[PDB]
Structure 1
């Protein structure tokens, strides 16, 4: 009936996603991260401030992605002319939802940067993405991506398409209350309510195998569920 035409900008993104799904054989690895200690650490770090900063879960996730990509360097790679290009630093592309679609500004040098610097760079790039004032060197590049959907409480889990020429992409669902067993100080078991987040990582099988993706997911889960390991 109504036949509004394609903008032309959508055609390049459609061809790019076509390239991604036709040259990257994707496989997904799902996990559930417990963030009950991460939320307490974020609450303490936000309460011990004078309005200098404001921390979110995405800052801890980007720092944990940097730590996990430094520990497993096979995921921090690409696919080039007969050659695998392996980087040292973790450059994390963060997806920002604008009314003109999707853009991925890059936070450069994630490992050894600082949570306040990460929060400042994410806020700068997000407000500049909403104003539409970016340079091509700010959204062209990166070694790993992350898609965030925590503001929507309906999305329990979702998958994402890998932006070429990267090798992996993360997808973070809304937190939910999951029943987790607990021992009391006597012999019986109990019911405790834990805040869990379903995290799905999509890997390219030409670069990352299933054991390498499982090791990356295990290190990410370790750094998330033990928040004091973000110091190291």
Structure 2
């Protein structure tokens, strides 16, 4: 061989590359972060999986969807889009899931309404239609939100760039076991922690509301029954 080698740039790669170069050259990004104590969600997930016959598995990712959607309702301006004339604020929540592929992106439609298990089945049927088969173009439209998680790969924390119609991304880290302070005799206990980062447009999301959004998301996940409200 030689010191270097070249391969032609892919077409779809240039499409994505145009989306990325464009959006990181236009949108004024900024990065907010928190930690989310995932133990209670782990208990409820174990239980609802026990109650289901094995008719359908449920991932942690589905709770992630349900909550981020309800939070988009509680704090609408994190769920809107910057058009040049007016800011466009949409009362229905679509959520697009950024799934890695040898970057296919199925959209879960109207997730603000449908329950957690129909969201899980929707994301799997969409993954089956994606990973090894063609999807209709209609599902790639980047509607109104994006979750993107890399905890399976062991990444602890990461900040993504967003796709330009939208104003935000949610990036999820690996769940881990940290030693928080406690009140028992030992003085401490183990806790499951997920580091969650959130990028925003910052012409539409001022920092106090990006924070408000992250607040509600944190409460729907720290205290899962409040998803019923």
TM-score (norm 1): 0.95
Q: In 1, are the aligned partners of 2:142 and 2:163 still within 8 Å (CA)? A: no
Q: 2:220 aligns with which of 202, 211, 223?
A: 223
Partner of 1:178: 178
Partner of 2:131: 130
Q: Post-superposition shift, 1:131?
A: 1.8
Distance in 1 of aligned mates of 2:51 and 2:71: 28
Partner of 1:103: 104
Q: In 1, are the aligned partners of 2:75 and 2:212 still within 8 Å (CA)? A: yes
Q: Post-superposition shift, 1:62?
A: 0.3
Distance in 2 of aligned mates of 1:3 and 1:215: 47
Residues paired across the two proteins, number: 226
Does the residue aligned with 2:76 lie in a helix, a strand or coil? Answer: coil
**What does 1:159-198 align with in structure 2 at a 5 Å threshold?**
159-184=159-184, 190-198=187-195
Q: Unpaired segments of 5 or more residues in structure 1? A: none
Distance in 1 of aligned mates of 2:145 and 2:164: 10
Structure 1 segments, 4+ long, off by >2 Å, are none
Distance in 2 of aligned mates of 1:22 and 1:152: 28
Q: In 2, are the aligned partners of 1:181 and 1:189 still within 8 Å (CA)? A: no
Q: 1:209 aligns with which of 206, 210, 213?
A: 206
Q: 1:199 aligns with which of 196, 200, 212?
A: 196
Q: Post-superposition shift, 1:152?
A: 1.4
Q: CA RMSD in A?
A: 1.1
Summarize deviations over 1:109-167 as a string: whole Å, max 9, x none: 111200111001000111111123211111113101010112112x1001111111101
Q: In 1, are the aligned partners of 2:151 and 2:172 still within 8 Å (CA)? A: yes
Distance in 1 of aligned mates of 2:89 and 2:104: 24
TM-score (norm 2): 0.96
Does the residue aligned with 1:3 lie in a helix, a strand or coil? Answer: strand
Distance in 2 of aligned mates of 1:25 and 1:124: 35
Partner of 1:87: 90
Q: In 2, are the aligned partners of 1:96 and 1:129 still within 8 Å (CA)? A: no
Q: Unpaired segments of 5 or more residues in structure 2? A: none
Partner of 1:144: 145
Partner of 2:158: 158
Partner of 1:9: 12
